[PDB]
């Protein structure tokens, strides 16, 4: 009866019209490519967030006959039935590129059916629902609504096969219901992390003995059991199970108890990221003003490393970055290297803007710059006016003002360029700060690697590091993201797209994903999985060193090469993987109609086994 | 971004010879941007640009508070307190003092005690009408001309 | 070129603390440019900017030629 | 060879007309090049750049001057 060639798609997540996590960015950035394929057969579903939806949504009138095509009437009627029963919603365009249509369910408008539902859940998958958990409350609310809505659509639509994709546990409850009520839709569940994953790696061992942990027990230990059960039940009840990365797939198999059928790696809208000489200069300006009074190194011999992302000290590998930096000092001292490495840390922390000290350094180097400008353009006018009129160029007036500016640059006796640009709220406990103290990278002139913690988002219109993050990355030389827990890693990933070499990790989604698709292409992968912590720290240092000892030739090439990897990360290509999962669902859902649509019975244990 | 696109399209059409010039892509990003400008319900434009360390007791605030200049559409005088030095490289009022003075219309200095008042004086030097006082040094001196 | 080079040298010195600023490479390109400016003996700045078609008979030229400016 | 953005037409051994054609063949292949193949070629030739500098090419005047000296004073050279 049902058409597989031209089917419907419904993608559901807590995040569709509110940025409350990473999944927001995946759905947002994926929209264009999937709208281009499905047009108005594609709709996204999520919880209408009343504080923000009006800023993100072109709210439409779904009652008007023009709203849908005839073909799609089922969803309109389906939407009708819904508002009949008191279920309010918003129908509209998500105001992002591609402008997919969205259906935003008002959880307030169904909070009545709360108790009836938390229970129908338990009597079907034995999922508890403590009432002091507002997330799960809404998670159940959402699920019951969407499964409801999908029933109606399934029932009403005699024409199309219906694929329904769900992202993360918070949007997973619809999955058990769909399989029980034998609802005629094929379902896919993608998890972007795990609950046991994120909670185990909160303190600091994992990748070695997760293979041997009592899931039912740990979950209970974290007061997470019920959340855990919603995630697991969503993984088993789905026609197709997926993770975002090969390494998250390893986690899941042993923590959720079901081997993903494939990988749905996060692509990017590469286009939207499109010059290094020009932004490097802006970093040169900040450095000259930060090291005023002890600027004793060659900027034509200095490389800029950086780490960036959320301030997750252990998870995003801050500790491994700093430690590996202290050692890289030694190796450069001890080899009497000529080069200098200024390594930035861009991780937003609690603060009270910039330090008096840091601001001053910058304003005086601006004054110098301005004074030299004034003086030189005078020199020019006096050189020119001599030449043309044919047949100590500094008057003492210019000598005075020069002398003053130079003097202002004087560093108080023994004071060192700070390791922070900012007033830290929690200066004594802050991990980054206390690490760099413990390893003693204090920006002495001996030290061949300097250190600069910038605990706040970069912003083009700032007094100190006057760059937008995107400009800053391009101005650097190397990005260093030594992650320990990173199911994907959007930050290493747009480093590469911007055309800038990067160090990542084989326990980082994007890292593991990259390991498959070596170092000559601008990608280094530290092995955090198999080597012991220390041999890991040593390999990171080994990579930095190699990158320093690199001739301007070898480096210009590397960058031209990684500048090419750019396009292998676009949804236009990474998307095919979602296609593979949608078709796997369809071939597992309707074995027969599928067989007819090819000629043969293609393999159905993987997405890869299928194409 | 939208207008330079419009321009390339007008120019191509023209160079080729022989009513929505905006493609729907450009409308989406425009819409979003106009929407981001929405004021939460009955939120009024602040009378301050900064977090005050001593908010409750500050004299200036509690004075604009007492006379109730809160920036309502009704009010024909808007009130902006900027408790810091002006700097060209600032996220908010990017301008060195001297630029800002020059771009203003009227300097107003109703000083009570001011043996000279270098501030009104150099407002004047920059070519900006000023209001000062006859118990201000510079005012008293200005009075004799 | 020369003055922005000078500029970058003063700026470096200054960002370092703790009389011929031009190196000899610069004095060469300058001397050349200055020398290029030499008029061949007694040649005065033309009173016209273009090649005339009817040079000998043109009224403007022939008038200024007549009043000897 | 032609991957570094240097095309050489054999005007020496082929008859005039087979030269013309080879010149045409080269232009053709160049047109039918994707803007990625092309960007790579330009990045390659941009590297041939420095092999044409006197710092390198000068070695050849050196080699010659010395041969002048090895030929003019065989004995003082042998000793050196």
């Amino acid at each position: 009866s049902r058409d597989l060639q031209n089917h419907l798609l419904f993608e559901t997540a807590t995040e569709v019209a509110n940025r409350v996590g990473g999944i927001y960015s995946v759905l947002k950035s994926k929209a264009p490519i999937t709208v281009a394929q499905y047009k108005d057969h594609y709709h996204l579903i999520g919880p209408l967030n009343k504080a923000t939806y009006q800023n993100e949504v072109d709210i439409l009138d779904w009652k008007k006959p023009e709203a849908f095509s005839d073909e799609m009437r089922p969803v309109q009627h389906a939407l009708q039935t819904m508002e009949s029963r008191g279920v309010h919603f918003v129908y509209g365009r998500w105001l992002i590129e591609g402008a997919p249509k969205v259906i935003l369910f008002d959880l307030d408008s169904v909070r009545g059916y709360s108790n009836e539902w938390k229970g129908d859940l338990w009597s079907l998958v034995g999922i508890p629902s403590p009432e002091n958990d507002f997330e799960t409350n809404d998670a159940i609310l959402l699920g019951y609504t969407v499964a409801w809505f999908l029933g109606e659509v399934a029932h009403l639509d005699s024409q199309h096969a219906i694929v329904a994709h769900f992202h993360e546990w918070l949007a997973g409850v619809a999955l058990p219901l769909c399989r029980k009520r034998r609802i005629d839709v094929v379902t896919i569940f993608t998890t972007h992390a795990t609950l046991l994953g994120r909670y185990l790696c909160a303190s600091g061992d994992f990748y070695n003995c997760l293979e041997s942990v009592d899931v039912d027990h740990e979950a209970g230990r974290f007061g997470i059991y019920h959340r855990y059960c919603i995630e697991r039940a969503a993984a088993h009840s789905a026609d197709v199970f997926t993770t975002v990365s090969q390494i998250t797939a390893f986690e899941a198999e042993h923590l959720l108890k079901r081997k993903p059928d494939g990988i749905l790696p996060n692509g990017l809208n590469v286009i939207k990221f499109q010059l290094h000489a020009l932004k490097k200069e802006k970093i040169n300006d900040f450095v000259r003003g930060h090291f005023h009074g002890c600027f004793d190194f060659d900027l034509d011999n200095t490389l800029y490393f950086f780490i960036a992302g959320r301030y997750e000290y252990k998870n995003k590998g801050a500790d491994m970055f700093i430690e590996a930096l202290a050692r890289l000092n030694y190796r450069l001292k001890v080899s009497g290297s000529k080069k200098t490495v200024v390594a930035f840390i861009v991780m937003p922390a609690k603060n009270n803007s910039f330090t008096v000290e840091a601001l001053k350094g910058q304003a005086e180097v601006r004054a110098l710059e301005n004074t030299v400008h004034e003086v030189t353009t005078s020199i020019g006018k006096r050189i020119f006016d001599h030449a043309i009129r044919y047949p100590e160029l500094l008057k003492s007036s210019d000598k005075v003002m020069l002398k003053r500016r130079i003097l202002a640059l004087r560093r108080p006796e023994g004071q060192l360029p700070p390791i922070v640009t900012h007033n830290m709220v929690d200066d004594a406990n802050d991990l980054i700060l206390n690490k760099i103290r413990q390893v003693q990278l204090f920006n002495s002139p001996s030290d061949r690697v300097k250190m600069i913690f910038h605990p706040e988002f970069l912003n083009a219109n700032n007094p100190i590091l006057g760059l937008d993050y995107d400009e800053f990355v391009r101005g650097c030389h190397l990005g260093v993201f030594p992650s320990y827990y990173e199911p994907w890693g959007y930050t290493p990933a747009e480093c590469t797209v911007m055309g800038v070499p990067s160090i990542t990790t084989n326990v980082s989604g994007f890292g593991s994903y990259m390991e498959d698709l070596a170092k000559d292409y601008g990608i280094y992968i530290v092995d955090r999985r198999f080597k012991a912590p220390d041999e890991s720290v040593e390999q990171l240092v080994d990579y930095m060193e190699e990158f320093v000892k690199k001739t301007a030739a070898q480096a210009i090439n590397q960058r031209n090469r990684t500048e090419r990897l750019s396009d292998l990360l676009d949804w236009k290509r990474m998307g095919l993987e979602y296609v593979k999962a949608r078709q796997l669902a369809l071939r597992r859902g309707y074995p027969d109609q599928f067989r007819e649509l090819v000629g043969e019975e293609l393999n159905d244990s993987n997405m890869d086994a299928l194409a | 971004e939208v207008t330079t696109s419009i321009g390339k399209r007008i120019f191509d059409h023209a160079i080729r010879y022989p009513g929505e010039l905006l493609k729907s892509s450009d409308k989406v990003m425009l819409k979003r941007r106009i929407l981001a400008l929405r004021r939460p319900e009955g939120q009024l434009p602040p009378i301050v640009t900064h977090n005050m360390v001593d908010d409750a007791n500050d004299l200036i605030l509690n004075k604009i508070r007492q006379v109730q200049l809160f920036n309502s559409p009704s009010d024909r005088v808007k009130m902006i307190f900027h408790p810091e030095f002006l700097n060209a490289n600032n996220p908010i009022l990017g301008l060195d003092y001297d630029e800002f003075v020059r771009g203003c219309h009227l300097g107003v200095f109703p000083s009570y005690y001011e043996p000279w008042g270098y501030t009104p004086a150099e407002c004047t030097v920059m070519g900006v009408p000023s209001i000062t006082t006859n118990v201000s040094g510079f005012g008293s001196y200005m009075e004799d001309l």
Side-chain angles (χ1 to χ4, degrees), chain A, chain B:
Chain A
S1 44
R2 232 141 199 169
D3 196 351
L4 300 201
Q5 196 75 222
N6 103 122
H7 55 101
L8 290 204
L9 176 52
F10 291 82
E11 203 154 11
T12 309
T14 310
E15 288 92 18
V16 311
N18 69 138
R19 166 201 324 276
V20 153
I23 304 162
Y24 176 96
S25 296
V26 183
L27 302 171
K28 185 213 197 187
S29 70
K30 206 176 45 62
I33 218 60
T34 112
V35 164
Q37 173 188 358
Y38 291 73
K39 260 61 147 49
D40 291 292
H41 290 49
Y42 174 68
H43 287 83
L44 276 136
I45 292 152
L48 172 78
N49 168 345
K50 287 177 181 172
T52 67
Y53 79 105
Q54 265 156 6
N55 291 319
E56 287 240 15
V57 190
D58 202 1
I59 140 166
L60 288 175
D61 186 40
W62 45 274
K63 274 157 170 155
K64 292 192 83 82
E66 303 87 28
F68 305 77
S69 72
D70 278 328
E71 185 165 9
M72 290 282 323
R73 280 276 115 63
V75 177
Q76 198 172 135
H77 287 110
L79 283 165
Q80 249 296 230
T81 304
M82 300 285 332
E83 115 149 64
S84 295
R85 308 262 226 104
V87 181
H88 293 318
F89 54 97
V90 164
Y91 186 76
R93 251 176 251 290
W94 188 11
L95 290 174
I96 65 172
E97 187 181 331
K101 270 164 181 172
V102 305
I103 300 179
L104 302 180
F105 284 116
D106 192 2
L107 297 205
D108 286 325
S109 94
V110 164
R111 196 167 252 95
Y113 297 53
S114 175
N115 287 345
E116 170 190 324
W117 279 349
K118 304 152 77 52
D120 169 290
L121 218 249
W122 171 259
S123 23
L124 223 96
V125 200
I127 305 161
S129 46
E131 34 175 352
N132 48 131
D133 184 323
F134 318 109
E135 272 94 301
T136 60
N137 268 348
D138 298 342
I140 297 161
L141 284 175
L142 173 70
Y144 272 104
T145 313
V146 179
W148 198 344
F149 166 83
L150 281 166
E152 291 291 346
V153 176
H155 180 250
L156 281 151
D157 202 59
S158 89
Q159 180 166 5
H160 317 111
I162 288 164
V163 190
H165 203 148
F166 307 73
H167 288 277
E168 205 68 356
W169 68 269
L170 301 157
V173 180
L175 277 146
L177 316 177
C178 283
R179 179 184 162 85
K180 210 309 185 292
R181 307 182 184 165
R182 221 98 38 164
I183 304 193
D184 195 4
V185 304
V186 278
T187 61
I188 309 181
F189 176 63
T190 296
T191 198
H192 291 253
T194 63
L195 276 163
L196 278 187
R198 293 211 102 106
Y199 274 77
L200 283 171
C201 298
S203 48
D205 189 2
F206 183 69
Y207 289 94
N208 290 321
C209 40
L210 64 64
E211 277 176 309
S212 68
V213 25
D214 194 340
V215 298
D216 278 318
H217 181 246
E218 306 291 343
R221 175 165 90 107
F222 294 123
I224 295 297
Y225 187 56
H226 57 296
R227 296 189 162 174
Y228 174 70
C229 297
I230 293 172
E231 195 164 52
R232 197 186 186 184
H236 293 276
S237 306
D239 295 344
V240 175
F241 187 28
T242 57
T243 60
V244 270
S245 76
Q246 261 305 155
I247 179 69
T248 308
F250 168 88
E251 273 192 61
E253 173 173 347
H254 297 148
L255 289 176
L256 294 190
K257 315 302 188 192
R258 163 169 190 192
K259 168 174 189 184
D261 310 310
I263 282 328
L264 291 184
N266 300 314
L268 286 153
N269 236 14
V270 160
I271 313 147
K272 147 179 169 164
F273 283 99
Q274 272 126 20
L275 183 76
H276 150 88
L278 166 60
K279 271 69 228 282
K280 193 205 158 205
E281 260 292 66
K282 267 175 185 165
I283 308 187
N284 276 350
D285 289 2
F286 156 83
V287 160
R288 278 192 218 99
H290 196 258
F291 295 78
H292 70 86
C294 22
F295 192 47
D296 63 347
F297 50 93
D298 195 8
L299 274 193
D300 279 345
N301 225 43
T302 20
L303 309 168
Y304 296 128
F305 293 7
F306 78 101
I307 196 184
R310 272 188 308 281
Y311 195 161
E312 288 176 52
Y313 174 59
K314 184 85 189 319
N315 282 351
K316 251 74 190 303
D319 60 352
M320 248 199 55
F321 179 45
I322 301 174
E323 186 68 59
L325 234 29
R327 285 154 154 89
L328 175 67
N329 213 11
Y330 203 96
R331 312 216 185 163
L332 286 183
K333 300 254 252 41
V334 164
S335 63
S337 190
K338 30 137 184 312
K339 289 159 181 306
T340 313
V341 170
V342 181
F344 301 87
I345 288 195
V346 183
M347 291 188 158
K350 275 295 162 161
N351 69 72
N352 308 294
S353 228
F354 307 93
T355 58
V356 135
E357 184 170 9
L359 282 184
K360 170 186 263 195
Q362 298 296 331
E364 302 286 32
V365 192
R366 251 79 277 157
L368 186 59
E369 296 182 343
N370 281 12
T371 293
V372 184
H373 184 63
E374 281 183 10
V375 155
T376 76
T377 85
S378 251
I379 290 175
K381 272 208 262 273
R382 285 189 289 248
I383 298 192
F384 182 91
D385 255 88
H386 183 248
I388 200 60
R389 227 64 153 249
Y390 225 53
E392 195 195 46
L393 261 156
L394 275 172
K395 34 203 219 76
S396 54
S397 193
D398 302 326
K399 288 190 159 197
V400 173
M401 41 172 157
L402 269 185
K403 219 156 213 294
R404 195 161 207 205
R405 299 288 142 241
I406 305 180
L407 291 173
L409 294 186
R410 196 185 284 266
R411 256 326 211 277
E413 234 88 13
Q415 159 183 137
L416 287 184
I419 56 169
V420 205
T421 57
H422 283 235
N423 288 314
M424 300 303 284
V425 165
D426 180 28
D427 200 283
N429 297 316
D430 184 79
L431 318 149
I432 304 247
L433 268 193
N434 285 323
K435 216 281 139 68
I436 38 210
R437 277 158 184 167
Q438 171 254 295
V439 291
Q440 293 178 295
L441 280 166
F442 281 109
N443 290 319
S444 309
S446 328
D447 299 324
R448 219 79 297 284
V449 281
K450 326 286 180 171
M451 194 74 194
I452 314 272
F453 183 17
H454 191 283
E456 181 64 54
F457 296 103
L458 291 172
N459 212 255
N461 29 114
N462 264 353
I464 268 167
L465 205 19
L467 281 165
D468 283 316
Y469 175 76
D470 79 290
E471 303 166 296
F472 179 75
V473 175
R474 293 195 161 98
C476 287
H477 291 280
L478 183 82
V480 180
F481 320 93
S483 311
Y484 187 65
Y485 195 80
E486 190 175 74
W488 178 242
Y490 253 130
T491 339
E494 49 183 55
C495 191
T496 293
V497 158
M498 264 153 163
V500 180
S502 10
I503 303 189
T504 189
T505 278
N506 75 346
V507 299
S508 144
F510 155 98
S512 74
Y513 171 80
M514 219 61 179
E515 210 181 32
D516 279 34
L517 199 57
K519 312 177 302 180
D520 217 31
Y521 261 44
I523 281 137
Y524 299 82
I525 306 147
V526 173
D527 175 353
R528 276 267 226 162
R529 195 160 154 198
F530 308 120
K531 321 206 169 199
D534 221 287
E535 316 162 54
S536 241
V537 177
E538 295 300 316
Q539 177 180 14
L540 178 49
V541 186
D542 288 341
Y543 288 142
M544 285 158 158
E545 193 163 12
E546 174 190 311
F547 182 79
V548 161
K549 307 196 159 166
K550 212 151 196 150
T551 84
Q554 307 168 256
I556 289 197
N557 281 338
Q558 201 181 40
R559 249 203 195 228
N560 281 319
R561 284 193 204 14
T562 112
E563 196 167 314
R564 275 184 259 151
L565 283 164
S566 188
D567 286 69
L568 302 189
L569 284 178
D570 192 278
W571 272 127
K572 299 187 200 199
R573 166 189 186 277
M574 306 264 288
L576 296 183
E577 287 306 288
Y578 269 66
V579 182
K580 287 190 202 173
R582 296 186 215 104
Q583 287 202 316
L584 177 59
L586 293 179
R587 151 66 182 89
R588 282 195 207 172
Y590 319 132
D592 313 297
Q593 333 197 203
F594 197 83
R595 191 173 290 107
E596 313 278 298
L597 225 72
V598 184
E600 41 190 308
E601 10 181 285
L602 281 153
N603 193 12
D604 81 310
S605 20
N606 304 319
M607 330 191 318
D608 277 344
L610 184 73
Chain B
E1 278 184 26
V2 151
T3 67
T4 79
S5 277
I6 284 173
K8 282 206 259 275
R9 283 193 283 281
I10 296 201
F11 184 93
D12 261 81
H13 166 258
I15 201 66
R16 245 66 188 231
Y17 231 61
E20 220 176 39
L21 257 170
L22 287 166
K23 43 197 203 74
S24 64
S25 180
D26 303 329
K27 279 184 171 185
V28 174
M29 41 177 166
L30 261 187
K31 226 171 229 273
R32 192 178 198 195
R33 292 281 160 253
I34 294 170
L35 286 188
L37 294 208
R38 185 185 294 264
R39 253 352 216 271
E41 230 100 12
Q43 162 175 124
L44 289 183
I47 65 196
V48 208
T49 52
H50 291 250
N51 301 303
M52 299 296 272
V53 170
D54 189 11
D55 202 325
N57 302 301
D58 186 78
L59 303 176
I60 305 261
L61 283 193
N62 281 346
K63 217 290 144 71
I64 54 217
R65 267 164 189 163
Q66 171 246 291
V67 310
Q68 290 185 305
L69 287 175
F70 280 104
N71 288 338
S72 321
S74 320
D75 292 325
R76 230 78 293 288
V77 248
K78 309 300 178 155
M79 194 73 211
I80 301 266
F81 178 22
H82 188 266
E84 186 61 74
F85 298 88
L86 289 175
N87 222 257
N89 37 108
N90 265 352
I92 275 181
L93 202 39
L95 273 157
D96 302 312
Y97 176 85
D98 71 282
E99 290 173 319
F100 168 85
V101 173
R102 276 194 163 93
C104 282
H105 293 288
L106 179 79
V108 180
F109 318 99
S111 322
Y112 185 63
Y113 192 68
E114 215 179 53
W116 180 244
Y118 254 123
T119 339
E122 69 168 60
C123 177
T124 292
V125 150
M126 276 169 187
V128 181
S130 351
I131 299 181
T132 184
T133 263
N134 73 345
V135 297
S136 149
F138 162 83
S140 78
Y141 176 72
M142 231 31 182
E143 212 174 25
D144 299 2
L145 307 167

